[PDB]
């Protein structure tokens, strides 16, 4: 008669049930809680609610989708959708112009009373809180322990609730399942997958596999915060566009304002901090902004290969890089004359290096004797420094940069 | 039917509480302080035995199971209705006692080597777990040799906590795809993964995967006890706030008061020990307190990199660290005259070290000749010791590193 009678009677009781062809499960949405259950589970629910087990579930057929920018239901290309994003209490919160003070001292302690980066991080957080999109930039908090990184992720975890992943470590990565990425606005990882993570930052779609559900490709809303107590947590390239790095070495127990209860006082102020974020006026040009802090510049120049730097010093004829790396030791160990010591650095700046001097340079930077064949296949050829050639210096075989 | 909770009420008469758990799609049955999650066909076999008939529809409520000792047996938050899965074991509902049974006191004195401050700090930690039933964010590592009583202290606490404790979790259970040893536990004991464990101590939520149950995120109540007979059981940073370390080298067979029966006499005193913990006056400012015992400081400085210690010595211009590590050998091998041996130390103390001396210093500490490129890529640059630059000393322009 009416194939949606049960759907309507449960809506009166504030309960919205549909069938999700995509997962072959029934969706039930209660009081800011969306569950996916099998039919036999849903039949047990409606018997408790309406006193009878219908043999046929008279409910509509929607496609579940987690999109926080869209209505409770919408449709596109004829297929009708129902939304799986339901905000937690502390996202539906009245704005505030200024944040609770003990929360303000926690972040100031984290950012070392630097306003530009702390304000840039809060602008990033506020954007996630208000606009609920993927930013494509992640924040790495590192340094020492007891600095507040663990608290700020428990502070945000009370704000974002089910939409945040807390302390995902290699134990969950080794799992065949992906639950920490399914319908999340923030994903926290503890300690750090060099490319597995760098991809998640800018992916729109991930394959979500979770236990007793179909493996499904959903759109990606994850923003990553990464805590690490190692000196070099990840390999970062010099052209990077994904990572902001903040090193904090101020321990919270050693500060003026800290008590034992401050950990739970800061946590019991989650409402105030959420109300602050709700009131930030976001600058959308600076959510995907990364800055090259000298801690990040430190991570990059320890990470990038030394053979790459030799090749690029060779390319830019940067004699000053070689002498910063101790090339002048070649003369005090009398490997080279004072006459030949000026021919050798002439060869670097000139971009025409005889095989004789090519080995002298590489062996003094690297600290072991390398052959010309090795130098070409590990420094010259892969980084395209130049061509090995006969040059009229007598016929000297040299490499000409270019 | 008439009342879609008729069956629920009739089993409560027999003292039996059954619900349906939307979160696990299983039926929960709670009997005599012990909770099961079963399939529908199993629960129908249970109620047939109780009421003599098999209902077609299970007239029971729909709750969400949650393990929170702070909350009532049922409650609600938002519209969602909850039922509690924590039900304390007998020796948690027991009348306190002001003083501990004697044979249990000699074990803890023996474990802690008759030091009261550290033993009392551990009992204060235990008492907090017993009285307040929360996660402390601090773990205890018992170390040393074998027969000291650490294993017995774990069977003693396992009789108190029973179902709320995980006993002798080893590498076999970690390699399993399942997590049952962390599901609804107040104490978790590990026998003998540096970051997997350092995170569990301070996490609020774990993803619990168990055999025939859905993988589900639950609240974390675990406090960790760690036994190990290796000299360096874990890597500990100097700023650590999670670990207390106790090394014990008193074997119990070698002590005066020990007999064959002492092992099971201590075990038959679980009630007396539980009542003592119930009566401890807890100081909560000291439950998450960690102390750096001389064994912990050994673990820290065995673990931290030599390049980090060099980099920090360079930073603090601590000439005495270098000579503590034998830098003066540079003079006994006549690598250096008596005169640059004075430039080399003032170069360290001034924080301005010519490349010439920087390689001499590093080679005598590390024991192999390293290049300037290597020193910057592994000591200078990563720990931000300073900038390599041309500095004008005397008349020549000397390449140096300026600490700052």
């Amino acid at each position: 008669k009416d194939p949606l009678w049960l759907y309507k009677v449960l809506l009166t009781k504030g309960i919205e049930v549909w069938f999700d062809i995509k997962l072959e499960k029934y969706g039930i949405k209660r009081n800011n809680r969306v569950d996916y259950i099998a039919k036999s589970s849903l039949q047990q629910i409606v018997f408790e609610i309406i006193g009878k087990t219908p043999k046929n579930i008279a409910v509509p057929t929607y496609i579940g989708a987690y999109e926080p920018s869209k209505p409770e239901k919408w449709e596109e290309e004829g297929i009708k959708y129902i939304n799986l994003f339901k905000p937690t209490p502390l996202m539906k919160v009245k704005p505030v112009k200024e944040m609770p003070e003990i929360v303000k001292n926690l972040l100031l302690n984290l950012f070392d009373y630097d306003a530009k980066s702390m304000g840039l991080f809060i602008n990033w957080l506020a954007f996630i809180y208000q606009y609920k999109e993927r930013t494509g930039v992640a924040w790495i908090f590192m340094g020492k322990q007891g600095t507040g990184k663990g608290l700020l992720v428990d502070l945000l975890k009370k704000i974002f609730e089910e939409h945040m992943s807390s302390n995902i470590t290699d134990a969950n990565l080794d799992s065949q399942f992906n639950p920490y990425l399914y319908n999340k606005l923030i994903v926290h990882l503890n300690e750090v997958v060099k490319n597995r993570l760098k991809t998640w930052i800018t992916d729109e779609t991930l394959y979500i596999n979770r236990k007793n559900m179909k493996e499904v490709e959903i759109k990606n809303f994850c923003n990553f915060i990464i805590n690490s107590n190692e000196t070099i947590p990840v390999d970062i390239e010099d052209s990077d566009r994904r990572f902001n790095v903040i090193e904090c070495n101020n321990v919270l127990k050693e500060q003026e304002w800290w008590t034992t209860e401050s950990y739970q006082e800061i946590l019991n102020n989650a409402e105030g901090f959420a109300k602050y974020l709700a009131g930030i006026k976001v600058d959308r040009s600076k959510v995907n902004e990364v800055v090259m802090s000298e801690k990040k510049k430190a991570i990059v120049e320890t990470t990038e290969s030394v053979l790459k730097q030799i090749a690029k010093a060779l390319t830019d004829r940067d004699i000053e890089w070689f002498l910063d790396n101790g090339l002048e030791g070649v003369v005090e160990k009398n490997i080279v004359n004072d006459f030949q010591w000026e021919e050798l650095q002439e060869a670097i700046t000139t971009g025409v290096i005889p095989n004789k001097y090519l080995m002298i340079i590489v062996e003094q930077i690297l600290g072991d004797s390398k052959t010309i064949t090795w130098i070409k296949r590990n420094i010259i050829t892969p980084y395209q420094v130049g061509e090995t050639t006969v040059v009229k210096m007598k016929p000297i075989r040299a490499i000409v940069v270019g």
Side-chain angles (χ1 to χ4, degrees), chain A residues 22-23 176 178 206-210 213-217:
Chain A
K22 192 175 176 194
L23 321 179
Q176 71 194 86
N178 261 353
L206 316 179
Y207 275 105
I208 292 299
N209 180 11
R210 304 133 35 237
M213 303 277 287
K214 319 218 283 193
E215 165 169 271
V216 156
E217 164 173 43

Side-chain angles (χ1 to χ4, degrees), chain A residues 161 163-173 175-191 193-194 196-236 238-260 262-263 266-267 269-270 272-274 276-327 329-364:
Chain A
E161 251 280 329
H163 306 236
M164 182 169 161
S165 279
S166 201
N167 294 35
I168 299 309
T169 177
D170 55 48
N172 319 71
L173 280 44
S175 170
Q176 71 194 86
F177 303 129
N178 261 353
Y180 45 88
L181 308 176
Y182 177 69
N183 301 346
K184 268 64 185 173
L185 293 163
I186 299 182
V187 179
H188 166 221
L189 262 47
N190 226 359
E191 295 153 29
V193 304
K194 319 167 158 179
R196 166 180 215 165
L197 160 70
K198 193 199 61 176
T199 317
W200 290 347
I201 300 285
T202 57
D203 217 341
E204 316 119 327
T205 75
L206 316 179
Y207 275 105
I208 292 299
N209 180 11
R210 304 133 35 237
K211 199 180 158 167
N212 298 330
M213 303 277 287
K214 319 218 283 193
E215 165 169 271
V216 156
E217 164 173 43
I218 50 137
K219 301 190 324 193
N220 173 22
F221 291 103
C222 310
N223 311 258
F224 291 82
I225 304 171
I226 299 163
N227 304 343
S228 171
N229 304 313
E230 314 270 333
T231 305
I232 307 307
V234 172
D235 314 88
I236 293 172
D238 176 17
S239 50
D240 175 8
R241 65 180 250 264
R242 303 187 174 76
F243 288 107
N244 284 292
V245 198
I246 308 290
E247 179 187 47
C248 181
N249 294 355
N250 313 319
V251 164
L252 282 170
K253 341 291 161 168
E254 304 179 344
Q255 315 286 322
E256 154 214 348
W257 53 273
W258 192 252
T259 177
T260 313
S262 298
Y263 190 58
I266 302 186
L267 265 180
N269 265 108
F273 184 52
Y276 173 63
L277 299 169
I280 273 52
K281 169 202 203 300
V282 200
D283 177 348
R284 226 182 175 289
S285 65
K286 298 211 307 180
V287 301
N288 67 356
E289 156 161 354
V290 307
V291 311
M292 174 82 62
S293 49
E294 254 183 344
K295 175 75 198 184
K296 185 159 113 160
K297 189 184 293 126
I299 292 172
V300 308
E301 311 173 323
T302 76
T303 292
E304 85 176 347
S305 181
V306 66
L307 318 180
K308 167 168 201 191
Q309 313 176 156
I310 296 173
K312 173 177 184 294
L314 241 38
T315 310
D316 301 350
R317 311 135 204 267
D318 178 339
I319 184 57
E320 175 70 88
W321 181 92
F322 284 105
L323 316 162
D324 266 359
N325 293 260
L327 171 62
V330 156
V331 56
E332 308 238 19
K333 318 205 276 196
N334 310 122
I335 285 156
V336 82
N337 285 348
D338 298 346
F339 292 72
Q340 307 167 321
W341 168 236
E342 300 262 342
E343 310 192 2
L344 184 158
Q345 32 184 337
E346 183 153 8
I348 288 165
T349 79
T350 292
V352 175
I353 311 155
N355 281 351
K356 159 167 194 164
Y357 293 128
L358 226 214
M359 304 181 271
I360 283 176
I361 296 160
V362 174
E363 163 176 20
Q364 170 89 7

Side-chain angles (χ1 to χ4, degrees), chain A residues 1-75 78-85 87-91 93 95-96 99-158:
Chain A
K1 309 76 187 152
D2 177 19
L4 290 54
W5 73 266
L6 173 63
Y7 172 59
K8 297 176 188 149
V9 154
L10 311 176
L11 272 169
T12 74
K13 317 279 180 273
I15 275 178
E16 189 161 35
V17 194
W18 70 99
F19 176 72
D20 204 296
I21 183 160
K22 192 175 176 194
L23 321 179
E24 313 187 47
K25 294 267 145 152
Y26 295 79
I28 188 168
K29 169 204 317 175
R30 333 185 295 174
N31 317 75
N32 298 3
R33 161 112 190 170
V34 282
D35 293 307
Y36 271 117
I37 58 184
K39 167 180 343 186
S40 44
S41 297
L42 164 66
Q43 305 187 298
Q44 170 74 50
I45 282 158
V46 292
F47 175 84
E48 178 236 12
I49 298 172
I50 76 174
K52 300 206 171 264
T53 311
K55 168 217 194 215
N56 304 313
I57 314 295
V59 301
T61 297
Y62 300 135
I63 295 264
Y66 177 101
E67 306 216 48
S69 197
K70 282 181 165 89
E72 308 194 304
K73 316 163 159 182
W74 73 94
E75 89 181 40
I79 214 157
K80 314 135 171 287
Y81 290 101
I82 186 169
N83 181 337
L84 305 163
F85 172 83
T88 170
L90 302 194
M91 314 182 192
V93 152
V96 154
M99 90 181 86
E101 190 193 8
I102 187 158
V103 179
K104 160 103 171 176
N105 316 326
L106 172 79
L107 309 183
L108 283 165
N109 180 279
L110 223 42
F111 292 86
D112 213 20
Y113 319 87
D114 166 69
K116 212 205 295 220
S117 65
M118 177 180 70
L120 174 51
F121 169 70
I122 277 156
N123 184 76
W124 183 81
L125 261 182
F127 172 85
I128 301 172
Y129 175 104
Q130 310 184 340
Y131 297 67
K132 312 179 197 297
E133 325 185 0
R134 177 190 63 256
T135 55
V137 162
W139 286 83
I140 300 177
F141 292 99
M142 71 177 73
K144 314 214 292 266
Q145 208 168 134
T147 65
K149 314 129 49 189
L151 173 58
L152 165 67
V153 302
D154 309 343
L155 176 68
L156 301 167
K157 177 92 185 147
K158 282 191 52 179

